[PDB]
């Protein structure tokens, strides 16, 4: 029937800084007439609701995205990938990395 739980901003005075989020619901002012919190002659609601459906074609369907950003501040680092190990051998002159 249409997934309307998804909304996206369409009208804003300016752009977004890197890693910036704004949840302000102020009615946009396309013109110069002030609006007292309601749309009207030159005011529109800045957020638009998606109508996602399984019947939607390719490119119009909902898509789930996750972005990983890595920070390496001079504080001690703890997020590191796994490091495997071999098997020990005895009675053999070998070079080791314990």
């Amino acid at each position: 029937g249409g997934n309307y739980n998804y909304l996206y901003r369409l009208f804003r005075k300016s752009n977004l800084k890197p890693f910036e989020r704004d949840i302000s619901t102020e009615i946009y002012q396309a013109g110069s007439t002030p609006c007292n919190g309601v749309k009207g002659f030159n005011c529109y609601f800045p957020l638009q609701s998606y109508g996602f459906q399984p019947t939607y074609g390719v490119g119009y369907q909902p898509y789930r995205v996750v972005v990983l950003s890595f920070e390496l501040l001079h504080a001690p680092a703890t997020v590191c990938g796994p490091k495997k190990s071999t098997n020990l051998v005895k009675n053999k002159c070998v070079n080791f990395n314990f």
Binding site: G31, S32, T33, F41, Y44, Q48, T55, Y56
Partner: protein, 596 residues
């Protein structure tokens, strides 16, 4: 505040809701046209009224914009399209009277019933039956009686309605800043944007008749051949100097002469090409037909048809109580939804119908990137022309043999080519004079140049001159012969099919030129020609975002509306008729009638 920026914001806000509302309405219409059921009527009521209430109040808001300072041509054109006020410019009583007369005209025209006088308890309709008896019969009294009954029991009571319908239509045409409704119908064939390609509504008035006189000798030779065939088939019924009655053409409107092909076959010894037996023996189902036809689009160069289409779209076998309409249509529901609605069967007619429908589907994909309001053709004569050009190109015996459908050892000659050319000409070029005269009639009746009394006389006296159709029985002023036609009680412009055919021929000639093909223009093959596909795709994607004058610049060499390819397509037919009607005078005389 600024106008253009807020105009763009309002346009985007409008389109955001227009997209999904049109998507919902189209989806509901598709669902019912696939699932015909009683519970799917109230939902269209609640969807259509909502669509109307969305298409007017937003257009009502499209009046605060002073569309005189907008610099962008696209924004200005889109706002002008939204700036239309519709027919609500009059008072409520006049508008409701117009709606009432339109609805009652449609209902009465949809109740055509004529009874045979011997048994007045058996009335037939426009459906097969009366129409079938008229089309396929060998007699004069029955067909003439059917014609008279249809144009008298349907062509009389609609006349008083038409009397004030015309004046009301012209009246809100005046209220819509148009001198006549003819210019309202000619508003589409106009561009007032970029310089050097300017077109006007009044230009099309004189742009219609001057492109037909070059085809007049061919039509005269075809009419002479038809008259000779009627003489050797219907003795003592057609004047050799004059012409044939209205009903003997094959259709009551004289639109098409397909029913007359068997009587006027050039070479009836050799049957026409039909590979329905190929499907029957090879067991080519609907999916096989569609895929083998899609190979043509793949070879052309157009993008491959979208996945999931076979799932959503119905194709064959309505079967049980689950009924679907058997009218082949291409549905563009929006939001990336495209579907086909046809009752696919084992028939080469169904083959060409599926070809045309998938051509419409590809055209639907063409304007996918266009905004909501620019997802339409530049003019009405492009969709059908695009659909039919490939159908004409995919009907050649070479095209049939290329897919392995036909043996490589045929012995085709000029006889079958001439037969096919005349069979196709009986419908393609045989409708141009009727279209021209009908369009002139509608333009002059909506222009008001002729009074009420000068309707039947002028219509008949120009029909005899142009088409060569005389009255089988006399008529009086109260009769309205054109009223018994589909696009006369429906308020639909008929000039689409006039420029549409010339677009077909011009684009086919251009493709044959830029497709590495030589010889006659009626045997061109455009398959496996990637370069030819780009020429069409350059304009198909544009839609209405660019002028039609610019549209006739990326496919055809010249933007002018010149009838170049019609005289060359039926060139073998013309040179064969040169050796056919030697002893018969070409033309007709407007002094002989079947009754007297």
């Amino acid at each position: 505040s600024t106008i253009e920026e807020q105009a763009k914001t309002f346009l985007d806000k409008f389109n955001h809701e227009a997209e999904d509302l049109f998507y919902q309405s189209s989806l509901a219409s598709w669902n019912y046209n696939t699932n015909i059921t009683e519970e799917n009527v109230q939902n269209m009521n609640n969807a259509g009224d909502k669509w109307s209430a969305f298409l007017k109040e937003q257009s009502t808001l499209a009046q605060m914009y002073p569309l005189q300072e907008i610099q962008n041509l696209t924004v200005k054109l889109q706002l002008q399209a939204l700036q239309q006020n519709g027919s609500s410019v009059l008072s409520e009583d006049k508008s409701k009277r117009l709606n009432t007369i339109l609805n009652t005209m449609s209902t009465i025209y949809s109740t055509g019933k004529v009874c045979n006088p011997d048994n007045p308890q058996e009335c037939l309709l426009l459906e097969p039956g009366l129409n079938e008896i008229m089309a396929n019969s060998l007699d004069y009294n029955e067909r003439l009686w059917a014609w008279e009954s249809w144009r008298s029991e349907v062509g009389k009571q609609l006349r008083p309605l038409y009397e004030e319908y015309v004046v009301l239509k012209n009246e809100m045409a005046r209220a819509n800043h148009y001198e006549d409704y003819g210019d309202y119908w000619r508003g589409d064939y106009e561009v007032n944007g970029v310089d050097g390609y300017d077109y006007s509504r009044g230009q099309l008035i004189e742009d219609v008749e001057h492109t037909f006189e070059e085809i007049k000798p061919l039509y005269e030779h075809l009419h002479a051949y038809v008259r000779a065939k009627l003489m050797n088939a219907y003795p003592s019924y057609i004047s050799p100097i004059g012409c044939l009655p209205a009903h003997l053409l094959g259709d009551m409107w004289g639109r098409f002469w397909t029913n007359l092909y068997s009587l006027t076959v050039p070479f009836g010894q050799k049957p026409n090409i039909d590979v329905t037996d190929a499907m029957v023996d090879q067991a080519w189902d609907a999916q096989r037909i569609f895929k083998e036809a899609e190979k043509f689009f793949v070879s052309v160069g157009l993008p491959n048809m979208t996945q999931g289409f076979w799932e959503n779209s119905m194709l064959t076998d309505p079967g049980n109580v689950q009924k679907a309409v058997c009218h082949p249509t291409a549905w563009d529901l929006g939001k990336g939804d495209f579907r086909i609605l046809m009752c696919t069967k084992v028939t080469m007619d169904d083959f060409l119908t599926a070809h045309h429908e998938m051509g419409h589907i590809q055209y639907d994909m063409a304007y996918a990137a266009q905004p909501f309001l620019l997802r339409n053709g530049a003019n009405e004569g492009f969709h059908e022309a695009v659909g039919e050009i490939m159908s004409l190109s995919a009907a050649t015996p070479k095209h049939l043999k290329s897919i392995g459908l036909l043996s490589p050892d045929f012995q085709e000659d000029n006889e079958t080519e001439i037969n096919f050319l005349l069979k196709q000409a009986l419908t393609i070029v045989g409708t141009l004079p009727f279209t021209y005269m009908l369009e002139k009639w509608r333009w002059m009746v909506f222009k008001g140049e002729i009074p009420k009394d000068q309707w039947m006389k002028k219509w008949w006296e120009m029909k005899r001159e142009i088409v060569g159709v005389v009255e089988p029985v006399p008529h009086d002023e109260t009769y309205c012969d054109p009223a018994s036609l589909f696009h006369v009680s429906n308020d639909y412009s008929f000039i689409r099919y006039y420029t549409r055919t010339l677009y077909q021929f011009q684009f086919q000639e251009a493709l044959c030129q830029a497709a590495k093909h030589e010889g006659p223009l009626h045997k061109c093959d455009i398959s496996n020609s990637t370069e030819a596909g780009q020429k069409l795709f350059n304009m198909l994607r544009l839609g209405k975002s660019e002028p039609w004058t610019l549209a006739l610049e990326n496919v055809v060499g010249a933007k002018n509306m010149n009838v170049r390819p019609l005289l060359n397509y039926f060139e073998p037919l013309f040179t064969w008729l040169k050796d056919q009607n030697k002893n018969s005078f070409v033309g007709w005389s407007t002094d002989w009638s079947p009754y007297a």
